[PDB]
Amino acid sequence: HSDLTFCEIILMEMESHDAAWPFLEPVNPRLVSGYRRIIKNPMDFSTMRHRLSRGGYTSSEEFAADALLVFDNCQTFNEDDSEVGKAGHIMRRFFESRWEEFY
Ligand SMILES: CC(=O)c1c(C)[nH]c(C(=O)N2CCC[C@@H](c3n[nH]cc3CN3CCCC3)C2)c1C
Ligand SMILES: [Mg+2]
Numbered sequence: 001h002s003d004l005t006f007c008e009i010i011l012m013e014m015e016s017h018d019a020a021w022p023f024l025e026p027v028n029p030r031l032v033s034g035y036r037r038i039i040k041n042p043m044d045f046s047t048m049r050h051r052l053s054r055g056g057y058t059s060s061e062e063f064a065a066d067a068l069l070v071f072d073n074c075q076t077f078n079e080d081d082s083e084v085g086k087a088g089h090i091m092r093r094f095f096e097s098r099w100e101e102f103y
Helices: 002-016 044-054 060-077 085-100
Strands: none
Touching: 002 044, 002 060, 002 085, 044 060, 060 085
């Protein structure tokens, strides 16, 4: 698959990005007050890595949906001027531009 090929490329670059530190592992709701109540479908890069490794993505569209979920959730829970929120805007702009320079 040429679609799955670029997903592996763009996931690799996001995992290694400087501003990827809030998204490398799932949020622990025990450690974050209100997260469980506010974020219905959590998502992060390791969950995407796991689903790609086991062949769980059909098309590149499903991969893009999970990536946009990460940043949608980030903007739903975190203030735009929080540390986590600022890293998410950097990561979201990176993904949007990189995804469009291929498709
Ligand atoms: C609540 C929220 O939307 C959020 C997201 C999407 N991500 C983070 C976040 O901060 N992390 C992600 C999980 C691991 C955390 C981690 N990994 N190694 C050490 C730490 C400790 N953190 C806390 C402060 C210093 C780093 C970092 C939040 C709050
Ligand atoms: Mg959107």
